[PDB]
Design an enzyme around this catalytic site. Structure first.
Site, short mmCIF file in Angstrom:
data_model
loop_
_atom_site.label_atom_id
_atom_site.label_comp_id
_atom_site.label_asym_id
_atom_site.label_seq_id
_atom_site.Cartn_x
_atom_site.Cartn_y
_atom_site.Cartn_z
N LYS A 1 0.81 -1.21 0.00
CA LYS A 1 0.00 0.00 0.00
C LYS A 1 0.85 1.27 0.00
O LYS A 1 0.38 2.34 -0.39
CB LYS A 1 -0.96 0.01 1.19
CG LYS A 1 -1.93 -1.18 1.25
CD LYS A 1 -2.88 -1.23 0.07
CE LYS A 1 -3.93 -2.35 0.21
NZ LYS A 1 -3.37 -3.70 0.13
N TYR B 1 -13.62 -13.69 3.37
CA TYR B 1 -12.62 -12.66 3.60
C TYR B 1 -12.17 -12.64 5.06
O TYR B 1 -12.98 -12.52 5.98
CB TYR B 1 -13.17 -11.29 3.22
CG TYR B 1 -12.22 -10.16 3.57
CD1 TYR B 1 -10.97 -10.05 2.96
CD2 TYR B 1 -12.57 -9.22 4.53
CE1 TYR B 1 -10.08 -9.04 3.30
CE2 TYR B 1 -11.69 -8.20 4.89
CZ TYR B 1 -10.44 -8.11 4.27
OH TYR B 1 -9.57 -7.11 4.62
N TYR C 1 -4.40 -12.35 3.58
CA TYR C 1 -3.91 -12.13 2.23
C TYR C 1 -2.82 -13.05 1.71
O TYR C 1 -3.08 -14.01 0.98
CB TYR C 1 -3.42 -10.69 2.10
CG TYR C 1 -4.48 -9.64 2.30
CD1 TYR C 1 -5.52 -9.49 1.38
CD2 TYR C 1 -4.47 -8.81 3.42
CE1 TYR C 1 -6.51 -8.53 1.57
CE2 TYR C 1 -5.46 -7.84 3.62
CZ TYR C 1 -6.47 -7.71 2.69
OH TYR C 1 -7.46 -6.78 2.88
C1 LIG Z 1 -3.82 -4.66 0.95
C2 LIG Z 1 -3.13 -6.04 0.75
C3 LIG Z 1 -3.44 -6.91 -0.36
C4 LIG Z 1 -4.46 -6.61 -1.44
O1 LIG Z 1 -4.14 -5.71 -2.47
P1 LIG Z 1 -5.17 -5.34 -3.59
O2 LIG Z 1 -4.32 -4.33 -4.47
O3 LIG Z 1 -6.24 -4.58 -2.95
O4 LIG Z 1 -5.52 -6.59 -4.28
C5 LIG Z 1 -2.80 -8.11 -0.47
N1 LIG Z 1 -1.86 -8.47 0.46
C6 LIG Z 1 -1.53 -7.66 1.54
C7 LIG Z 1 -0.47 -8.14 2.52
C8 LIG Z 1 -2.16 -6.44 1.69
O5 LIG Z 1 -1.84 -5.62 2.75
#
Ligand SMILES: *Cc1c(COP(=O)(O)O)cnc(C)c1O
Ligand SMILES: *Cc1c(COP(=O)(O)O)cnc(C)c1O
EC number: 3.5.99.7
Lengths: 341, 341
Positions: free
Chosen positions: A51, A269, A295
């Site tokens: 991010k 999720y 994630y």
């Molecule tokens: C925010 C995040 C994602 C997702 O990213 P997108 O661009 O929204 O698909 C994936 N992995 C981690 C560790 C994240 O912090």
């Protein structure tokens, strides 16, 4: 083709390193040589993360205009909000965070899931954290708009920063530059990546990598692993981000569809599955690299599921993308009992 | 001047980066120019940190001979133990970690202090985590010597890694290289650091910087902030480690004493004071940089205290050393409540 024509504000140490997970490779059969581009080892801003690459192309705007509040949004253990807080701190601006309930707070963690982890860090950094219990959605939420209206009516000048940045005008630029970066590192390292594996839920990271790789006609190298369990809107939104971003950087290519494996999103999720946890453990046990239950854990299992089934050519070099997100691991402590010995 | 004669196995991305904390420096009345060398961002091995730098000069010895288990020891939320797991996982060796009872676990933090933070990480990396009741002590521990014997009895070949690697034979080499990085980086920065601030508990970090900075006759530039609350031994061991190392690299100068501020350890190791919580909140609110209630939050509160009292010449360039420890932060959420707006 040119992200260079866009203003960028430095928030990382520079090009994110690439780790050679050679030990994990052997363990998985030596079929493919797995590599990891460490976006989680981004900067010194509250642990870093993908991010942060996205925000670099958004900050110039904030600074150029007269803004006093940075408002974002996301789920409880939102990585986004935590990085928006660190950014707000660095720019000397106020910060508001809308922590909605997007994950069915596991029982054996209902007493810490909202106090420990990333949400704690946003607090330590002085952000106006707000715990709301609205539904999960990777799109514009009707609590973000009201927060804005509020601060405005209060005589403040808020800056809107949607979930994961994704739906921000320049939300896809950061990872376009990610693409230009891998291209150079391939020459410095002397290794070509046949494929790129990365997690995906709100879009921008994947979309940015696609539009950016398109520059060299390699969009097809990308392999997204859904983690939102809502492939429906996740693919359509990622796809729409990929187009609007390709246009911005001068890419003609029209994206109509992309590799979005949806076999590891379940049960939903934020909630891992038996496979997720095993992936995290294997990665950790084999490399010393941590991945979260929401994630990267799900993208790492997908990476391992694919390798198992000889999905990649023999001796392929695959670039796994570690977007970070580990700091939320403390809110899922219950899923990792001590290794029997 | 000879840390090059010794072997070194790469465990970090490369020379640590130096952040320029100008916003914090302004906040503290523009008294000095605060810079922070980031040991907390030095590796992909689960958050990395200072201990990882120490370990680089110990891994060669390990791989050389035949050991099957790496053993180390520390408190519940220990950093060293967690980094030993990652090192072991990577080297493909087994891991046995003694987690003594070094800290009066806060009442609010009793149902988490042992399930979250650093300890959790070690478990995910499949280390044999042993929660023991022994108390705080920076010297060789009984539980340690027992472990070596246990495992060695079971027909295994354990490798002994004491607390913070400090008492290891080569535990001082690590930061003698840090001194080298500092001088080189002053050159590439076009500026000279007048003083170096750095937390100090088990010894080797400060000890190595002392013997290293001494290569250039600059030991007096070192300023340690104690967080043990047992100054007497902390200063005793640190001084001994610094002396043994000095002989290894060829430095004649003998260290008889060194600057060790002990005004901020209170009330005890592992527990912050309103000052610490205040520093952690200041640094985070000003730079988006996170420090820990145990070590760095104190080195930081001391730094702030020293600046206020005009300890440094006006406009001095002060290199604060961020050794990591932020992962253990999840075990102290009680202390950081949402700030009011
Ligand atoms: C925010 C995040 C994602 C997702 O990213 P997108 O661009 O929204 O698909 C994936 N992995 C981690 C560790 C994240 O912090
Ligand atoms: C281990 C550690 C220290 C102490 O290092 P010594 O060499 O034992 O003085 C300080 N801060 C952090 C974050 C640590 O992990």
């Amino acid at each position: 083709a040119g992200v260079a024509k866009f203003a960028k504000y430095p928030l990382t140490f520079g090009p994110s390193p690439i780790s050679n997970l050679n030990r994990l490779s052997q363990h998985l059969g030596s079929k493919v040589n797995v590599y990891a581009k460490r976006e989680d080892c981004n900067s010194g801003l509250a642990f870093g993360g993908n991010k942060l690459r996205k925000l670099e192309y958004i900050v110039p705007d904030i600074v150029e205009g007269d803004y006093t509040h940075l408002v974002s949004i996301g789920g409880r253990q939102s990585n986004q909000t935590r990085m928006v807080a660190a950014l707000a701190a660095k720019l000397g601006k106020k910060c508001v965070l809308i922590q909605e309930d997007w994950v069915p707070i596991p029982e054996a963690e209902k007493d810490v899931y909202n106090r420990v982890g990333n949400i704690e860090l946003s607090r330590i950094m002085g952000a106006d954290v707000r715990v709301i219990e609205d539904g999960f959605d990777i799109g514009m939420r009707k609590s973000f708009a009201n927060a804005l209206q509020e601060l405005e009516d209060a005589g403040h000048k808020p800056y809107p920063i949607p979930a994961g940045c994704s739906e921000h005008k320049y939300g896809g630029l950061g990872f376009v530059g990610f693409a230009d970066e891998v291209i150079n590192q391939e020459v410095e390292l002397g290794i070509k990546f046949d494929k790129i594996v990365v997690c995906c839920v709100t879009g921008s990271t994947t979309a940015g990598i696609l539009a950016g790789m398109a520059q060299y006609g390699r969009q097809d190298d990308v392999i997204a692993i859904d983690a939102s369990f809502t492939s429906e809107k996740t693919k359509e939104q990622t796809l729409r981000i990929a187009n609007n971003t390709a246009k911005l950087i001068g890419v003609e290519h029209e994206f109509k569809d992309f590799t979005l494996d949806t076999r590891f999103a379940y049960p939903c999720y934020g909630v891992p599955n038996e496979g997720t946890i095993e992936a995290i453990r294997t990665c950790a046990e084999q490399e010393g690299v941590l991945t979260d239950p929401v994630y990267e854990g799900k993208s790492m299992q997908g990476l391992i599921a694919l390798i198992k089934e000889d999905y990649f050519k023999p001796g392929a070099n695959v670039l796994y993308v570690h977007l970070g997100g580990a700091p939320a691991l403390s809110a899922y402590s219950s899923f990792f009992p001590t290794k029997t010995a």
